[PDB]
Design an enzyme around this catalytic site. Structure first.
Site, PDB file in Angstrom:
ATOM      1  N   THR A 239       0.714  -1.310   0.133  1.00 13.55           N
ATOM      2  CA  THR A 239       0.032  -0.083   0.027  1.00 13.55           C
ATOM      3  C   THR A 239       0.801   1.202  -0.125  1.00 13.55           C
ATOM      4  O   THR A 239       0.451   2.249  -0.881  1.00 13.55           O
ATOM      5  CB  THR A 239      -0.949  -0.046   1.282  1.00 13.55           C
ATOM      6  OG1 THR A 239      -1.733  -1.478   1.247  1.00 13.55           O
ATOM      7  CG2 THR A 239      -1.949   1.144   0.894  1.00 13.55           C
ATOM      8  N   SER A 282      -5.975   1.000   0.235  1.00 14.19           N
ATOM      9  CA  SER A 282      -6.709  -0.181   0.937  1.00 14.19           C
ATOM     10  C   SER A 282      -8.124   0.017   0.903  1.00 14.19           C
ATOM     11  O   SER A 282      -8.739   0.608   1.975  1.00 14.19           O
ATOM     12  CB  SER A 282      -5.920  -0.343   2.109  1.00 14.19           C
ATOM     13  OG  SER A 282      -6.348  -1.593   2.728  1.00 14.19           O
ATOM     14  N   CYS A 348      -5.766   1.834  11.279  1.00 17.01           N
ATOM     15  CA  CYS A 348      -4.343   1.363  10.942  1.00 17.01           C
ATOM     16  C   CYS A 348      -3.292   1.891  12.045  1.00 17.01           C
ATOM     17  O   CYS A 348      -3.052   3.107  12.221  1.00 17.01           O
ATOM     18  CB  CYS A 348      -3.843   2.071   9.581  1.00 17.01           C
ATOM     19  SG  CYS A 348      -2.538   1.395   9.203  1.00 17.01           S
ATOM     20  N   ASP A 389      -7.307  -3.186  -5.486  1.00 16.52           N
ATOM     21  CA  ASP A 389      -7.101  -2.084  -5.110  1.00 16.52           C
ATOM     22  C   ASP A 389      -6.297  -1.116  -6.004  1.00 16.52           C
ATOM     23  O   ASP A 389      -5.318  -1.702  -6.814  1.00 16.52           O
ATOM     24  CB  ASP A 389      -6.447  -2.031  -3.702  1.00 16.52           C
ATOM     25  CG  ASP A 389      -7.440  -2.661  -2.682  1.00 16.52           C
ATOM     26  OD1 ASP A 389      -8.472  -1.816  -2.537  1.00 16.52           O
ATOM     27  OD2 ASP A 389      -7.045  -3.151  -1.721  1.00 16.52           O
TER      28      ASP A 389
HETATM   29  C1  HEM Z   1      -0.568   4.831   3.134  1.00 20.16           C
HETATM   30  C2  HEM Z   1      -0.410   3.601   3.643  1.00 20.16           C
HETATM   31  C3  HEM Z   1      -1.391   2.760   4.486  1.00 20.16           C
HETATM   32  C4  HEM Z   1      -2.678   2.651   4.176  1.00 20.16           C
HETATM   33  C5  HEM Z   1      -3.709   3.599   3.475  1.00 20.16           C
HETATM   34  C6  HEM Z   1      -3.316   1.901   5.239  1.00 20.16           C
HETATM   35  C7  HEM Z   1      -4.623   1.567   5.437  1.00 20.16           C
HETATM   36  C8  HEM Z   1      -5.212   0.738   6.319  1.00 20.16           C
HETATM   37  C9  HEM Z   1      -6.449   0.393   6.418  1.00 20.16           C
HETATM   38  C10 HEM Z   1      -7.663   0.711   5.830  1.00 20.16           C
HETATM   39  C11 HEM Z   1      -6.490  -0.529   7.530  1.00 20.16           C
HETATM   40  C12 HEM Z   1      -7.817  -1.242   7.955  1.00 20.16           C
HETATM   41  C13 HEM Z   1      -8.238  -0.230   9.428  1.00 20.16           C
HETATM   42  C14 HEM Z   1      -9.508  -0.832  10.220  1.00 20.16           C
HETATM   43  O1  HEM Z   1      -9.887  -2.014  10.352  1.00 20.16           O
HETATM   44  O2  HEM Z   1     -10.334   0.049  10.372  1.00 20.16           O
HETATM   45  C15 HEM Z   1      -5.114  -0.738   8.261  1.00 20.16           C
HETATM   46  C16 HEM Z   1      -4.845  -1.697   9.334  1.00 20.16           C
HETATM   47  C17 HEM Z   1      -3.704  -1.803   9.439  1.00 20.16           C
HETATM   48  N1  HEM Z   1      -2.567  -1.399   8.883  1.00 20.16           N
HETATM   49 FE1  HEM Z   1      -2.448  -0.299   7.573  1.00 20.16          FE
HETATM   50  N2  HEM Z   1      -2.218   1.169   6.155  1.00 20.16           N
HETATM   51  C18 HEM Z   1      -0.950   1.650   5.559  1.00 20.16           C
HETATM   52  C19 HEM Z   1       0.248   1.405   6.059  1.00 20.16           C
HETATM   53  C20 HEM Z   1       0.542   0.678   6.976  1.00 20.16           C
HETATM   54  C21 HEM Z   1       1.848   0.341   7.549  1.00 20.16           C
HETATM   55  C22 HEM Z   1       3.205   0.906   6.879  1.00 20.16           C
HETATM   56  C23 HEM Z   1       1.790  -0.860   8.338  1.00 20.16           C
HETATM   57  C24 HEM Z   1       2.739  -1.597   9.182  1.00 20.16           C
HETATM   58  C25 HEM Z   1       3.972  -1.022   9.816  1.00 20.16           C
HETATM   59  C26 HEM Z   1       0.251  -1.013   8.479  1.00 20.16           C
HETATM   60  C27 HEM Z   1      -0.329  -1.924   9.093  1.00 20.16           C
HETATM   61  C28 HEM Z   1      -1.556  -2.124   9.501  1.00 20.16           C
HETATM   62  C29 HEM Z   1      -2.051  -2.939  10.536  1.00 20.16           C
HETATM   63  C30 HEM Z   1      -1.280  -4.074  11.711  1.00 20.16           C
HETATM   64  C31 HEM Z   1      -3.457  -2.968  10.483  1.00 20.16           C
HETATM   65  C32 HEM Z   1      -4.259  -3.689  11.543  1.00 20.16           C
HETATM   66  C33 HEM Z   1      -4.801  -2.947  12.548  1.00 20.16           C
HETATM   67  C34 HEM Z   1      -5.739  -3.582  13.456  1.00 20.16           C
HETATM   68  O3  HEM Z   1      -6.575  -4.277  13.236  1.00 20.16           O
HETATM   69  O4  HEM Z   1      -5.600  -3.341  14.636  1.00 20.16           O
HETATM   70  N3  HEM Z   1      -0.373  -0.286   7.759  1.00 20.16           N
HETATM   71  N4  HEM Z   1      -4.310  -0.093   7.240  1.00 20.16           N
END
Ligand code: HEM
Length: 399
Positions: A239, A282, A348, A389
């Site tokens: 992403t 995403s 996130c 996506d």
């Molecule tokens: C621009 C970059 C990114 C976008 C647009 C993005 C977007 C998202 C989205 C839409 C979710 C779903 C959140 C929800 O359930 O409400 C999410 C969850 C998550 N993202 Fe990201 N993300 C990004 C970058 C990252 C990076 C760099 C990491 C890790 C280092 C990461 C780790 C996670 C994790 C672990 C979750 C699950 C969190 C949970 O369920 O508690 N993401 N992200």
């Protein structure tokens, strides 16, 4: 009931269905790959409700969970990490790794983020483009988030380039299943070894913190540590790559706004906020099943029925964002949050890190390369397949 996921209307655009559904049937049924029916939620207010309602579950072994492909259905069999947990298990495990991603911790990382971006841009300069365009993805957009998250996990500098390539192979559209699953095993095997090492001599990295604070006391074992480390790597990296590439392409499409960024790099934060709203890279992560009957708008969702909440549609919601289909880094922002990073407890974990990376990139890139140009006609940009996506596979540039 229409088949879901929908296809994007074109390379850079969301599916056309969403706007029609928001206007005429905002909570509707869709047909999933296996014939089962799920509920699709499209308005900003309803997405926020799905994301926070305590009557809805992320546990994937509950009846009705809306898997979108056959691989997700079998992935559901593995022992879950906190991405697939409900309270209170969710925050119990999530809090083990949250300290690295707080706004305070991300502030302290900012010199390292800047040095990483500077080094990779200077390498690209030294490579030059005297023999044809270079791929901004391969040269810059891919290594920037890869090097940072690998380094935070604890991977040593000499291993970064190989592991960056392996992770790219996982999600590359032209990989065969054998290539992708071999790359996947390569990553898991490497992390298990790094966990064994940090268990014997911890350093100052996420894996060391997990080994010291959780594995050795017995709160988790070392295989959970591998799984959590793997989740932090694969959840957001592809992403991040797409957001960087989409930002460049978007700026190429809006010359007036690129001109403002060149003359005022301090506009990078606002450019990033609008980028993450407009290009919701995403869009299929906010999925639930209902633990009880629950009413959403004018629809009753029965217990054991699946829900998909489209944050992509919510980020174009006319009722929240004026002129939502215009890219406008100078827009005025309403009180409601854009949902690029989700909402509620599961929002996130890396939102602040991701934005700090994106902001560092777009406040630096055009100061380093003031004549950076996409080298192919904008109508010929190689976007991800329309059934996936939004993203960009490769992006030839000159500078
Ligand atoms: C621009 C970059 C990114 C976008 C647009 C993005 C977007 C998202 C989205 C839409 C979710 C779903 C959140 C929800 O359930 O409400 C999410 C969850 C998550 N993202 Fe990201 N993300 C990004 C970058 C990252 C990076 C760099 C990491 C890790 C280092 C990461 C780790 C996670 C994790 C672990 C979750 C699950 C969190 C949970 O369920 O508690 N993401 N992200």
């Amino acid at each position: 009931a229409p088949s879901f996921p929908f296809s994007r209307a074109s390379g850079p655009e969301p599916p056309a269905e969403f706007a029609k559904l928001r206007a005429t049937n905002p909570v509707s049924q869709v047909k999933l790959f296996d014939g089962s029916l799920a509920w699709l939620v499209t308005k900003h207010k309803d997405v926020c409700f799905v994301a926070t309602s305590e009557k809805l579950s992320k546990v994937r072994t509950r009846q009705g969970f809306p898997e979108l492909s056959a691989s997700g259905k079998q992935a559901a069999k593995a022992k879950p990490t906190f991405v697939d947990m409900d309270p209170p298990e969710h925050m119990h495990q999530r809090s083990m790794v949250e300290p690295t991603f707080t706004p305070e911790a991300v502030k302290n990382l900012q010199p390292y983020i800047q040095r990483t971006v500077d080094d990779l841009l200077e390498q690209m300069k030294q490579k030059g483009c005297a023999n044809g365009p270079v791929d901004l993805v391969k040269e810059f957009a891919l290594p920037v988030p890869s090097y940072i998250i690998y380094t935070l996990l604890g991977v040593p500098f000499n291993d970064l380039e190989y592991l960056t390539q392996q992770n790219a192979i996982r999600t590359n559209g032209s990989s065969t299943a054998r290539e992708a699953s071999a790359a996947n095993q390569e990553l898991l095997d490497y992390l298990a070894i790094l966990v064994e090492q940090r268990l014997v001599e911890p350093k100052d990295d996420i894996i060391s913190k997990l080994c010291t604070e959780q594995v050795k006391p017995g709160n988790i074992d070392k295989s959970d540590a591998v799984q959590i480390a793997f989740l932090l790597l694969v959840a957001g990296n592809a992403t991040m790559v797409n957001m960087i590439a989409l930002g460049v392409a978007t700026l190429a499409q809006h010359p007036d706004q690129l001109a403002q960024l060149k003359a005022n790099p301090s506009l990078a934060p606002q450019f990033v906020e609008e980028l993450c709203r407009y290009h919701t890279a995403s869009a299929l992560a906010i999925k639930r099943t209902a633990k009880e009957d629950v009413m959403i708008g004018d629809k009753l969702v029965r217990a054991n029925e699946g829900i998909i909440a489209s944050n992509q549609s919510a980020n174009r919601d006319e009722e929240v964002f004026e002129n939502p289909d215009e890219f406008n880094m100078n827009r005025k922002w309403p009180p409601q949050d854009p949902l690029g990073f989700g909402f509620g407890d599961h929002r996130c974990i890396a939102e602040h890190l991701a934005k700090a990376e994106l902001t560092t990139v777009f406040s630096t890139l055009y100061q380093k390369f003031p004549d950076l140009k996409v080298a192919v006609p904008l109508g010929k940009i190689n976007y991800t397949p329309l059934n996936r996506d939004v993203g960009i596979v490769d992006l030839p540039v000159i500078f």
